[PDB]
Each structure stands twice: as structure tokens, then as C-alpha cells.
Amino acid sequence: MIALIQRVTRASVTVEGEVTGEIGAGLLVLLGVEKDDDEQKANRLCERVLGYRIFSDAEGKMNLNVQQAGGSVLVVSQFTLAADTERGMRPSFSKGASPDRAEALYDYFVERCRQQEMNTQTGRFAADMQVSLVNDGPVTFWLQV
Amino acid sequence: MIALIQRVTRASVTVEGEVTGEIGAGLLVLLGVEKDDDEQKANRLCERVLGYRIFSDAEGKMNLNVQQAGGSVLVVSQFTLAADTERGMRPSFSKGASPDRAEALYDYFVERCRQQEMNTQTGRFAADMQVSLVNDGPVTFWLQV
Ligand SMILES: [Zn+2]
Ligand SMILES: [Zn+2]
Ligand SMILES: [Zn+2]
Ligand SMILES: [Zn+2]
Ligand SMILES: [Zn+2]
Ligand SMILES: [Zn+2]
Ligand SMILES: [Zn+2]
Ligand SMILES: [Zn+2]
């Protein structure tokens, strides 16, 4: 499973013009579910994402994770992260997850976030969305399990 | 060299609220310079970025590159991409180039983009930047050479 995370000052997802998910400071998590993922992997990824020390302390050093910073998490499914982009001008998608299993793992990841007492927001699993955000830094990390 | 690209309807970079670069439809390119990168790597990555077929055609199918779609490119320096996120809650930048080298190759990459007659806007190297964007889809790809 892949989590391409961006530290944000704000982020929102609109589906058909209406806001379906919106947060202030925190993380925008683009989640890519892979063919062989399971809850165990989703769990470890969630753990790593929420514990990643990339938020400024009361003095300016990155020593705090999103929970300590009091930030939120906006999770959006991104099938393109699991793409094979090794060669050529066209991505190939075969390492991606199946139809249903993908949503199940996505929902699971989101629920695990909420279970960690995180103010969590989402976008409809496979809907065409416009994700607005302000990447603060910028700070962007590729996490994968 | 790494380019984490996001398909956008608009994007802009500000430093303390001041715009340094701004584009409409196109690609936001977060650039990560690696330790042994050189001009040849930059040349190749530029070619892949400007040629990646991730824009919709007439039939709304992902088949055109940013040049064909008539889009623009906003390049922003991003050190965190070359980080090793294998274990621990703290990133390790052992594969990332030093500040001076990263800047030199970032500037070179930007100039290369411009030479391809591509409307190229940028952030400001080493500056604390707020990158505002609207990821259309969303569509996000990790490209590397
Ligand atoms: Zn619509
Ligand atoms: Zn569901
Ligand atoms: Zn719950
Ligand atoms: Zn101004
Ligand atoms: Zn080396
Ligand atoms: Zn210097
Ligand atoms: Zn420079
Ligand atoms: Zn020039």
C-alpha cells in the first residue's frame, strides 16, 4: 500500500462542485491500494503516516507528528500511485488493486485513522474529484508497505 | 532525479504570501535532486515530464502530454522526495544531493524545460513555500531517472 503524503495548511476535495471533505492544517494522504495489500499492511502504513515527524515544534524543528501538531488527515484514493512508471511516456496499471477489495482496504485505512482519534476527511473512493490544497513547505513523502 | 508530478487546473507558489510562480492548467512538478545526478539525468527527466501522457484527449481519455494539452509547468524544488522512508518516523536524506548541487541542477532542469518552449513557472530554491494547487482527478505520478 502506498501513501503519498503532503503536509498542508488546508485541503479540500470537491465532487461535482460540492465539498465532500475538507481540513485545515494536517496531511493530504493520497492512498494507493496494491494487489497484495491486506489489513495488516494498511495498519502499518496508517501507523507510519500518523507518526511521521514532519511538523514544526514550538521552535521550528520537524519533531512532531500530525497527531501532536493537532492536525487533521484528508484521505483520497489515488490509483496512479501504484502505476508502473519505470519506462516510456505511458504508465501501466497492473500492480493496482482489484475493484471491490480496493475500496474495502481504502475504507479500512480511513476507519483506522478515525480509530486513532484523528479528525479525518475523505473523498468518494473512485469519483472524479478536484483536490484543492496548500502544500506547506512544500513537504512531500512517499511511504509504502 | 525525481519528479513527483500532479495534474492541475491551476497552481501557484508563494513565499510569505508573495507569488513567485503561477500557472493555469498543466503540471505541478516537485523536483528531487539525488546525490549523483548530473545534466544528463536532468535532460532525461525533463523529457519524461514534458512527454508523460496523462492529460485527457477529445474523448476524455488519458492520452496527451502537457505540451499537446496546451498546459504549463510549475517547477518547485522538493528535497523530501529523495528521502529514504524505509523505517523509523524520521526521514533519512542520504540519497539526496547537497543544497548547492540540488540548486544547480534544479536551475538547470528549469532552464531545460524553458528551452522546450514550455511556459515554465517556478518556486524559489530553499525558500519556505506554500504551494497552492487543484489536483484534477486527482492524478499523481512518481517519475524517476
Ligand atoms: Zn461532473
Ligand atoms: Zn466504501
Ligand atoms: Zn469510526
Ligand atoms: Zn505580488
Ligand atoms: Zn553515489
Ligand atoms: Zn551555497
Ligand atoms: Zn539558483
Ligand atoms: Zn533560457
UniProtKB/Swiss-Prot annotation, chains A, B:
Q: Which GO terms describe its molecular function?
A: aminoacyl-tRNA deacylase activity; D-aminoacyl-tRNA deacylase activity; D-tyrosyl-tRNA(Tyr) deacylase activity; Gly-tRNA(Ala) deacylase activity; protein homodimerization activity; Ser(Gly)-tRNA(Ala) hydrolase activity; tRNA binding
Q: What SUPFAM superfamilies does this protein map onto?
A: DTD-like (SSF69500)
The subcellular localization recorded is: Cytoplasm
* Cellular component terms per the entry's GO annotation: cytoplasm
Which EC class is the enzyme in?
Answer: hydrolase
Per the record, the domain comment is: A Gly-cisPro motif from one monomer fits into the active site of the other monomer to allow specific chiral rejection of L-amino acids.
Q: Which CDD domains match?
A: Dtyr_deacylase
Query: Which domain of life does the protein's organism represent?
Result: Bacteria
Annotated GO biological processes are: aminoacyl-tRNA metabolism involved in translational fidelity; D-amino acid catabolic process; response to heat; tRNA metabolic process
Main subcellular localization, coarse class?
cytoplasm
The family assignment reads: Belongs to the DTD family.
Pfam families attached to this UniProt entry: Tyr_Deacylase (PF02580)
What are the top taxonomic ranks of the organism?
Bacteria, Pseudomonadati, Pseudomonadota, Gammaproteobacteria, Enterobacterales
Gene inactivation phenotype reads: No phenotype in rich or minimal medium, decreased growth rate in the presence of excess D-tyrosine. A double dtd-dadA deletion mutant has a more pronounced growth defect in the presence of D-Tyr (in strain K12 / EC989). In a dtd deletion mutant about 40% of tRNA(Tyr) is D-tyrosyl-tRNA(Tyr); overexpressing the gene for tRNA(Tyr) suppresses the toxicity of D-Tyr by increasing the levels of L-tyrosyl-tRNA(Tyr) available for translation. Decreased growth in the presence of D-Asp, D-Ser, D-Gln and D-Trp. Poor growth on 20 mg/ml D-Tyr, no growth on 500 mg/ml D-Tyr or 20 mg/ml D-Trp.
Instruction: Please list which residues make up the signal peptide.
Output: none
Q: What is this protein called?
A: D-aminoacyl-tRNA deacylase
Q: Which reaction does it catalyse?
A: glycyl-tRNA(Ala) + H2O = tRNA(Ala) + glycine + H(+); a D-aminoacyl-tRNA + H2O = a tRNA + a D-alpha-amino acid + H(+); D-tyrosyl-tRNA(Tyr) + H2O = D-tyrosine + tRNA(Tyr)
Alphabetized, the UniProt keywords read: Cytoplasm, Hydrolase, RNA-binding, tRNA-binding
Which ranges belong to the motif Gly-cisPro motif, important for rejection of L-amino acids?
137-138
Q: What does this protein do?
A: An aminoacyl-tRNA editing enzyme that deacylates mischarged D-aminoacyl-tRNAs, has no observable editing activity on tRNAs charged with cognate L-amino acid. Edits mischarged glycyl-tRNA(Ala) more efficiently than AlaRS. Acts via tRNA-based rather than protein-based catalysis. Rejects correctly charged L-amino acid-tRNAs from its binding site rather than specifically recognizing incorrectly charged D-amino acid-tRNAs.
Xref: NCBIfam families: D-aminoacyl-tRNA deacylase
**E.C. code:** 3.1.1.96
- Which InterPro entries would you find in this protein's record? Daa-tRNA_deacyls_DTD, DTD-like_sf
Substitution effect: M129K: Alters stereospecificity, confers binding of L-amino acids while slightly decreasing binding of D-amino acids
Q: How does it assemble?
A: Homodimer.
